[model samples]
Target chain A: VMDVMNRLILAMDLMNRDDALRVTGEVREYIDTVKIGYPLVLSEGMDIIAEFRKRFGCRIIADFKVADIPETNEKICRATFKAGADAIIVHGFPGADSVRACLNVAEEMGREVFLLTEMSHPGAEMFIQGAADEIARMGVDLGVKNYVGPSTRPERLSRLREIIGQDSFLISAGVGAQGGDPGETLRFADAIIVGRSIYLADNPAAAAAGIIESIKDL
Target chain B: MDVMNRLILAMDLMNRDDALRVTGEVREYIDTVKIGYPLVLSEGMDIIAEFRKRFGCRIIADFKVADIPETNEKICRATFKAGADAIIVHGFPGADSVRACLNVAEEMGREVFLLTEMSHPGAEMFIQGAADEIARMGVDLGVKNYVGPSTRPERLSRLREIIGQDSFLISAGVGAQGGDPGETLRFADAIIVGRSIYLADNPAAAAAGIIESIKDLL
Candidate 1:
C-alpha cells in the first residue's frame, strides 16, 4: 500500500487560508498527504482541516508537534482529528505516558500519530539528538506506526529507518530551501514533507510534479 | 518600581467569547496575560491586540517557537507587531533559533522568554536534561527573561538556582494543575495560572485571591 512513487507530501505551511487552499488545489493530485503546520492551524482554525479534507480528498496531517500533559495532549489530539485530520504529529520527548495518551486518542478516533523524534532544523542536535535513539525505542514500545525523521541529514534518516524497522513509516521534511536532497532521502523516508519549495514556487503544480517525478525515479 | 506580586493569567480558553469575558474579569488583578496556542488559534492575533487595548497590561505570547532561524524570526516579528510585550520561545531548537527570536525581540524593543523546562511531568524526559545547557545559552544570548519549571517545588528551586537571581523567572501549573500559588511565588518572578482562575465560578475573585496569596507571603 505504501509505494515510493506516491509518497511526496506537500507541507501546506502557509499562514493564510486563500494561499493554503490555492497551493493545495494545485498539487492535490500529485501528493498523497498534506502536512498542516502551526502557522496555518493558528491563523485559521480546525475548519481549515475540514475544508482541505473536503476539497483535496488526500490524507490530512495536523503538524501540531504536541508537547503537553497526558490530559492536554488527549484534548488537542481529539480536537485535531474531530476537525478531520487523518493523523497528528506529537513531540516524542514527552515520554511514554504522554505518547501513549496521544496514541490512545488516535486509536479511538481511527487516526494516526507521527512522533517527532528529531526536527529538520540545524539546531535540533542540541535539544533532540541526545534523546533521538531512546525516543525511537519508546515510540515503538508505545506502538507508534509513524515517526518524523530529518530529511536534511541522510545518515540520521537511515539510522531512524533502521531503528523503526521497514514496516513503520518515516515522514521526512527539510527538502528544497532546507537543502535536503529528495533522491538521497527517498532511499529511507516513506513520505517527504516539503513546504517552501512547492508553495512559494512560481508554478506550484509544476514544482510538486517535479518532486513526484523524482520520487517515481527512485 | 517592581511590585512583589507577579502573576500571569494564562488565558488558555478555546472560545473567543470566553477568552474575552475572562480577560475582562481578571484584567484589574493581573499585570501580564499569557495568550497560548489554543486562544491564538481560536481568535487569531486580533485577540492579542484586543487584550492589549482592553487590559493595558503586558502581553506574553506563549508561542514556544522551535523552528529554524528564518521561521523563528518571522514568528517573533509577527508576534511583536501584534502587540505582545514578550514572546515565549522553545530552547529545543538550540542557540541559533533562540538567538534569531531574541534578535527580533531586541530590534522591536520587546522581550523573549526562553522556555528552559515546561510545567508538565512529561517535560522531565526531554527538557529537564538539557535545561542547564539551554540556561547557559540564554545567558550567552543576553536573554534576561525565562519560563522556569514550577509544577513541582524541587524543580522550581533547582531551576531558580540554575538561572540565578539576575534573570526574571516565570512559572506555571498552579491550583487546578496541582502547584500551589504561595509556594510558586517563593522563587518565580511570576506565576502563570490557567484552569484554576479561568474555569472557576468567579474568575475575577479567583485571580484576585491568587495575587493576594502571593502578596500575603511577602
Candidate 2:
C-alpha cells in the first residue's frame, strides 16, 4: 500500500529538472508522493525518479500511461521500475494480455500497477467514457488493486468507485486546473491528485496547504 | 514520403547491445525504425540519436501517448526534443489530447501518427467499436498520417478509407502477431514487425525475407 500525506499526490508535471524538483520540494510538507510522467522523465531522464526519492523521500509514480502490445508492455514496466519508480500507471484499454504483461513485471519487482480507467479530458466522452466502465471491470477481473479516474465528473468517478469496490485504492485527477472540486472528488476517491494549481502557483506550499485546509474536516 | 522499404523494424528490445546489433543487421532492409517505450525507457532518449548516427535510421517513437492536454503537449515536446522524426499517438483520449501532440509536433517540425485501431487481444470489446470514430476524428483534425491494425485487414482498410488515400498510413501486428506483410501492405504504407524478425536465428535474413515476400507490391 502507498502512503499519501494530506491525501494529496503532487502531479509534478513541470518539464525542467530545476522547476520540477524545486516545486516538488516546495510542496514537500503537504505531499509525500509525486507522479512523474514523460514530461519530466523525457526532459531530465528517468533518473529524475531517483532524484525525487533521494531529495524529498517521495514515492514516484511514473505516469507513462503504458499502452502497448503485451511484450512491449513488460519491457516498459521493467525500465520504469528500474529507474526507481515505486509504481507505474498503465492503460487497460490495450487488452488483458497487455495489462497482464505490466502486472507480471510489477508483481515480480514488488511494485504497484495503477490501472487508468476513465480520463478527465472532454474528448474522453467520444470513446473512453463509453468503454471506461468495461475497462474498470476488466481491471477488477485481472485482480488490480489500484486505479486512476476522472475527478471532473463525480458521477463517473462514483461509478468507478463502485466497480473497483471499497478495498481498492482510487485516486482522482482533474482537481485543480481541469475544474474538479477537491472535497467533492474525495467523497469517491481515496486521494485527489493535484498538479498545475499547486505546481504552477506563485507559492506551491501555500497552495497545497490551502487545498488541504479546504478539506481538512474530511 | 518515407524510406522504409515497405518494412519498418519495431525494435522493442530492452537492452542496448541486442537492439543495436539486430537493427544494425537489418540496416539494408529497413531505413525506418519504430522505437517504443521498451527500448527508450531502458536505454534512455540518447538511443534515438544512437540509432540515427550508427545506422542512419528514422526513429518513430511509438509512445501511444494518452494523457491530459497539458501533459500531452509536454510529452510530445519531450519526444521530439529527443530527436524522434515522428511519434505514434492514440486517438482514444479525445480531441484535446490529440491536438496537444499535433500542436507540439508541428511546432517542433516533427510528425504525429494517430493510431486508430490497435491489433491487440482486448481491443475487440471497446476500441473495435470506437476506432471508426477515432479515425474520422483524425480526418476532422486534418491529420495527414495514421497507424492502424495489420491483423484485421477489413478494419485497416476501413481506416484507410476514413483517412483517405493521400494520408500516410502505417500498420502494425505483423509477423509474430499473425499479420502477413504482403496483405498488410495493401492497407498500410509500411508494415511494423518486431519479434518475428528480431527473434529469428538470422535477423537480417528474416527482414530481407519479409521484404522479399512483398517485393511485388513495393
Candidate 3:
C-alpha cells in the first residue's frame, strides 16, 4: 500500500545536507520514495526528514533499523514518526516484543511499520538468514502488513513473500551495487531499494532511468 | 576500562531538557551514561555533546546498531562524529556487519560494544538461544566491549565466560527490570541502570542506593 514510484526507492545515505538534498532531488523523477538511515539523520538531524518532505514532496522511510528494549523501542518510534517519517523500519531480530512496541506507536500515530526480516549483506547468513522465516511468521501473527527483505537473494525474497502471503506488501534492498538485478528482484519484491548504483553515480538520474529501462520489459 | 563506581546511567528519557536535567542531577554519582535513540531521535545528536559539556560524562551510544555492513559503517561514522565515546552494536547480524563497525571505530579511534542479547522476557524466544554464539562471535571478531542482560545472572556469567575476563563487560535491566545490582556486578564490570535511576523523583538518590548495594564489590 506504500506508494513507490516505478517500484524503485532510493536509499539516500549521503551525509552532507546539500549533497543529500541535491542527489535526492536529481533522482526524484524516478523515485517518489526514499529510505533514509543514521548516515543522513545523525548528520543533518531529524529535521532533514521535514526538509525532504517540503522540498521534494516525496515519501520518507526512516530506516533506523530499530533494535532496543520494549520501553525504548516505543520511544524511538514515537520520536521517529514525530519527525515526519511516513513509515519507519523496525528490526525483527530483536524479538516480538520490540517489534510490537514499534507497532503500537505506529498504529497510534497512524503510520506504517515495515519489519526488516532479512538483510542483503553476506553477514546476514551468519545469524539472520536462519531465523528470518520465523520472523516473517511472527510479523504475520502480529498483524503486520509490510515487510522488508533482500533483493540480492530472490530465493529468500520468495520465501519471505510466501510467508507473508499476498495480503502483505514486500520491499527489498541491494538491487544495484549489491549485484541484484532489478527485473528479477521485482518478480518477488513489490519494490527494490537502490543506493550506491544511483547515488554514487556521476549522473544519478540517468543511472535510475537506465535501471527503470532495463526492467521496462517486465 | 573502569566505569564510574562500576555503574553507568541508561538515559532513555526522550526530552532534551528532561534528559539533560536528570543526567545533571545525577552527575555526582556517575561519569558514564548510555544514551539511546529515545534521547537522540527525540532531541537530536547534539544532546550527546550537550551531556558531554554539561556533565563531562563518557557518552555511550546504546544504538543496538542492526544493519548491513555498508550502512553499519556509515552509522558508526555518524555516531562517533556526534561525539559518542563508544557505541553498542548488535552482533546478531553476523561477523561481517560487526566487522564494519569495528573497521570504522578503528579509523575514528572510538570503541564498539557488541550486544550479545537483550534483557526483556521476549528475548528468551530467539536471542537467548543465540546469546552464547553471539558472544563467541564478538570474541572472534576481536570486540573488546560487550553488553548482556543483567536480569539473568546465569546468562550474564555464561556470556562473560565466552568473552573472557580480558574484555570489558556491561549489563542492562538492573533497575526497574528486577535485576539485582550486587548479583549482576558479579559478572558485569559495570551495570547499566535506566528507569530505576532516570525515572526516579531523585535520580541521584536512586543511583546512590544502587551504588551502596554494590559498594563491597566497588
Candidate 4:
C-alpha cells in the first residue's frame, strides 16, 4: 500500500533563489506549501506567494507564527489568510484561548492551522514531547486538528498519532537543513516541511530533487 | 535622580537612514541602541555588533527567543557576548523555556526583559489574564516583564495592582500604532516608540518628541 501526504516547503532562511525566474520556477515543482517566514515574508510579502501559486497549484503556508492575543491573532490570521495562505501557524504556548482564536479563524476561512508542537532543534525534543502532548490535548479540545512535529523521533509521530488518533492532520519537519530524515519521519506525517537543505544548497533544484527522491522512496 | 540607562530605537528597517545618522541621533538622545526583527532581518546580524562599534551605546539585539531551551540558551549567551545590553524572551514561551533563558542570563550575568505582548487586540486574552501566572513566575524569578500597546491605559492600574508597582513594563507600539504616549508613559517604566521615531520625516526630532512626551506625562 502506498501512502501519500501533503508536501510543504518551509522556507525559514534569508535567501532562496538568486533571481525571480529561478525562485518562481522552483515553486512550480516539488513545492506543495511554502512557508514565507519573517525574512522573506517582510521583504517580499504576498508577491512571493502570488508568483508561486500563479505557476503552481500548491498551497501557500505563511508561517508568520503569530503570538499575539485573541483579537490581534484573529486579525493577523484573517489578514494572513487573505494574503493567500492555505495554512498558517500559531504558537500553542500562547495559551488555549489564543490557540482557539487562531484555530477558529483558520476554520472560518477554511484554511489549515498547524500548531508549533515541536521544533527541529536537537533540544526541541525536551519541549516538543511534553508540550506537544499537552497542546495536542488542548488543541483537539479547541477543534484544532492539525499539528506540527519534528522528524527526530518516529516514536513521537506514533505517539502523537495514537494520542490524536488518525483523524487529525500531522506535519513533520527535520528534512534538509535540520537533518530530519524525511523518509524516516514521513511514515508518521501527513505532510513534510523542508527548509534549509534545499533552499541553501549550491543547487537548490538538485537539493529539492533529493528530497523528492526520498519522498518517492517513502 | 534621572536614571540614564539605555535607549534603543528598536529599528524595523535597515536602510531607513545611515548608521552614522542613526548612531549620532541615538548618541544625542538614547543611552543605548537596540535592533529588532525588522532591522535585523533586513540588514542581517552583522549590523548588530557594528551598531555597538559605531554608536558606543550598549547594543540590544532584540531577537525574540522562542525556540527550545538549549538553542535558546546558546543564542542568549551569543547575544550577550555580541554586546547586547538586554534581550527579549517572550512571557508566553512558558516556564521551562523562561527558566532555561534565565539560566543563561544568570550564568552570563546578562539582563533579560520578558516581552509580555505587543498592544494588539489579542494581547488582552493572550497575556492579560496571565498576570498571576507571570507575576508568580517572573517577580521572584528576577526577570522584568514587558507590556506592549494592547495593554490598555485602564488595564495599567490593574496590571500594576497584580504585578506590583515596582515591577517593570516596557510600553511599545506608540506613535505610528496610534498608542497614546501620554497615557502609556504613566504606566510603563520604559517607553518603546519605534516607527513614530524611526520612520519620521525627521527621526531625531521624532526621538526628542517621544522623550519629551514621556517627561511631559511625568
Candidate 5:
C-alpha cells in the first residue's frame, strides 16, 4: 500500500495510443496511475482507459476536468468510471452542487474524484488563486479527500494543504517540462503527476525512475 | 454563405450510430456540428473524422480545455487535426493558456471559441463575474469565436454586449435545458441544440424548425 502511495502518476497526455502504451509499459514500475487527459480521450477513446488498466495493471485517472451542470456531471462521471477509471478529476468552478453531484455518482460507483482547486499553469493563478480557499472548503465539506494542487509554486501548494488540511490527498501536476521541482513538490504533495519529463524522454523508464528516486530522499 | 444562418447542432448524444444518424438527418440545416466530451469519450476520433468527411460541414469539439499551456495546446492541436473546424475552450485557465490554444488554432487555420460563460445552473458560482475579463482577453488574444451563457437571458445579453456584435457567439441551453432558442438568438450568432433535436422523434424536422427560428430572428 505504501508502495502504491509512493508511486508517481504518469500523465499520459499523448495524442497517440501506441506511444502512450509503449511509454507506460516501459515506466510501469515507477508509476501508480496513468492520468488520461483530453488529448488521449479525444484522439483515442475511453477504451484507452480500460486498455491502460489491462496493460499496465495500474489505476486510471480520467482527467476530464468536468465543468457542466449536476445532471451532465453525474452522467459524465458515471460513464467515465464505468469505462474503468479508478478516479476522475473535476473542475470546482461550477460550484459545490456540481461537485456534490459528481461525488454522489462516485460514491455509488465506488470510484474517487479529485477536485481541481488550482491548475498547474502560471496563468492559472489569475483566476483560480482567488477562489482557492473556498474551493478547498467546499471539497472538504462535500467529503472529498483528494484535491489537485499546482506543484509549480510550492508556496501556493503549502497554502492549499493548510486550507484542505494535511490529511487530504494532494495530487500535484506541473512537475516536469512545465518547470516544477519534483523534490520540493513531493514535500507537500502526496503524488506528483509528471508528463513530458517521462513520456517525452528518450528513456521513459529512466526518467520516471529518476523522479521516483528524487522523492525517496525528500 | 450567410454567417447569420449558421445553426450548430450539438451532438451531445452518447451512442455513435445514433449521433451519426441524427447528423445525417440534420446536415442540411446545421452549419456546424458541436460534439462534446460524451460522444467523443464514448466513441473516439474516428467518429469525428467520419462526421467531417460524410457531412462536409464545420465541426466543433466542445473540449472546454482548462489546463496548462503545453497540455492545452496539445489538446487543441489534436482536436483540429482530427477535422474540427473550431474547438471550444474555457476561460478559467486565464489569458495565457487561452492564447496557447488560439495560437495553435491560428497556426492550423482553425478557430478557437473562448467560453466566456457556461449555460449550466452551477455557472453562477465562479464563471458569472469573469465574463467581462474573458471577453477583453478574447479581444486581446484576437479570438473571433466565443461561447455565451445559455441558461440566463440577461447574462447572455450582457456577454454579447461585452464581446461585441462582430464576434461570432454561440449559446447552448435551449430546448431540454429550458432556454429559449429565439430569446438566445437575440444575443448569439448561433444556437447549439443537442438533446432537443437528437432525442426528438423527428430530428430532421426539429433541426429544420431550429434553422427557421434563427432565420426568423435574422
Candidate 6:
C-alpha cells in the first residue's frame, strides 16, 4: 500500500532557487516533502513555492510557525494551504484557541496541522519543559493527528507516545546531530524531520538512503 | 568638548570598489559603525572587527539572533567577546527566549535590543495588533524596550506607552519608504541610516544633517 511518509528534511536556505535546485536532486531518492521555511519563503514569497511545486512536483511543508488569534491563524492556514502546502505548523503554546483554530482551518482545507510541542535545539529545555504546561495540555486535549514531538532518551518516548498516541503523527527531529538512535526514533514517530546531519554528510543522497533504509526496515 | 558620538555602521558590500569607498565617507560623518547579516555572511566575522580597527569607534554586530533561547544566550556572549558593543535578537523569538537573553545581558552587562517588528510588508498585522502579548512578554522578560520597524512611527510611542517609561528604542528601515527624520526622530532613541545615507551625494553631509535634525528635536 503506502510506503509511509518517513523522513521530512528541512532544506534550510536563505536562497530559494539554490535550495530548490539542490533539493530537487534529493527528491529523486527521498519522498519529496520539502520544507519551504520562513527564511527562504520570506526572502522569496509565494511565487517560489508555486515554482518549486511546479518543478519538483513534491509536497511542500511551509514551516512558518504561526502564532496569533483564531481569525488570523485561520486565514494564514488557508492562505498557506491554498498556496500549496500539504502541512504547516502553528505554535500551540500561544494558546489552546490558536492551536484549535489552526487544526480547524487545516482540516477544513484537507491539510495537516503539526502543533509544535518542542523544537530540536539546545535552548528548548527551558520554556518548553516548565515555563507553563499550556502547550503540552493543548496537545493532550486537542489530540490532533499531527504534532512535532521528540525525545533523545529512548525511555522517554513511551510516556510521550502514550500522551500523543500513535494514531496521531509525531514529526520528530534531532535523530542525526543529536545522535538519538534512528531505530529508537522510528519506534516512536510516524514522520522524521532532519537537516544538518544528512546535508553535511559526505554524500547526502546515500546518507538519506541509509537513514530511510534503516527506518523502513525498522 | 565633543559629546560621545553614537556610531551607525552601514553594512555596505565592502567587497566592491564603490561600496568600500562609502565606508570611508561614512567614517568621517559617524562616530560608531555596524556590520549586519549580509556583510557578515559575505566576507566573514573577521572583517567586522577589522572594520572596527580601521574605522576607530563604536562597532555593532547586527547578527539578528532569532534562534532558540540557549543558542541566543551563548551566541550573544560570544558576539560580545568577539568585540561587538551591541547586538539584536528578534522579538519573534518569543518572550521566553527574550527573557533568557535579557538574563544573559544582565549577567554580562551587554547591550541588547529586541526587534519588535521589521519593515517587511506582512509584519504589521502580527506586531501592531498583538500589543498586549508583547507588553506581557516585555514586562515578564525584563527587556529594556524594543526596536519597532518603520511605516508606523507612532508604533514606537504606542509601544513605549505600553512598555512604559524605562524602555528604549531603535528605529530602522527609515528614510525611503519610511520618510524623513523630522517625522520619525521624535519616536526613536537611535536612527539606523543605511543605503540612503551611504548612497547620498555626500554620506558625511547626509549623516551630519540627520544627526543635527535629531539633536534639534532634543
Candidate 1: regions farther than 4 A off: A1-5, B1-4
Instruction: Give model 3's docking category.
Output: high
Residue-by-residue lDDT tens digits, candidate 6, A112-155: 88776665555455344332244655677886666666546454
Candidate 2 chain B minimal-lDDT segment of 10 residues? B1-10
Report the C-alpha lDDT of model 4 over A1-218, residue by residue, as the tens digit: 01222355546444333353365356456665566654454434445666667766666676656565454467667766766878787777666767878888888998878777656665454334455776677777777777777776677767777767687887876665556777777778777777667665777777777777767855
| CA lDDT, candidate 1, residue A191 | 78
For each candidate in turn, the TM-score is 0.91, 0.97, 0.98, 0.59, 0.94, 0.56
> Model 5 in CAPRI terms: which quality?
medium
Please provide, for model 4 over B1-218, each residue's C-alpha lDDT reduced to its tens digit, 9 standing for 90 to 100. Answer: 02232234656554535644755765688765656544544444556667767666666556556754544565576566656767777655566667778887788877777765546554553455554455556666776655545246766545555566776666666666666767776676666656677667888887777677666444
**DockQ for the candidates, in order:** 0.47, 0.78, 0.85, 0.12, 0.63, 0.05
lDDT of 2 by residue, A62-84 (tens): 89999888878888898998889
Model 4, residue pairs in steric clash = A69-B122, A69-B123, A70-B122, A71-B122, A72-B122, A174-A180, A177-A197, B7-B32, B119-B149, B119-B150
Estimate how well candidate 3 is docked, as a DockQ score: 0.85
- State which docking tier applies to candidate 1: acceptable
Query: Per-residue lDDT tens digits of candidate 1, residues A121-164?
Result: 87888878888988998898888888998999888889899999
Q: How close to the true structure is residue B82 of candidate 5, measured as C-alpha lDDT?
A: 83
Weakest 10 consecutive residues, lDDT, candidate 4 chain B? B1-10
Q: What is the lDDT of candidate 5?
A: 0.82
TM-score of chain A of 3: 0.98
- A6 Cα displacement, candidate 3 (Å): 0.4
Per-residue lDDT of candidate 5, residues A149-190 (tens digit): 988889888888998887888889988788889888888888
Which model is ahead, 1 or 5, in terms of lDDT?
Answer: 5
- Model 5, span B1-218: residue lDDT tens: 13425577888788888888888987777667888777877777777888877887778888778887887888898888888888888887798889899889889998898898888766777877777887888888888888886679898888888778898888888888898888888888788888889889999998778777666675
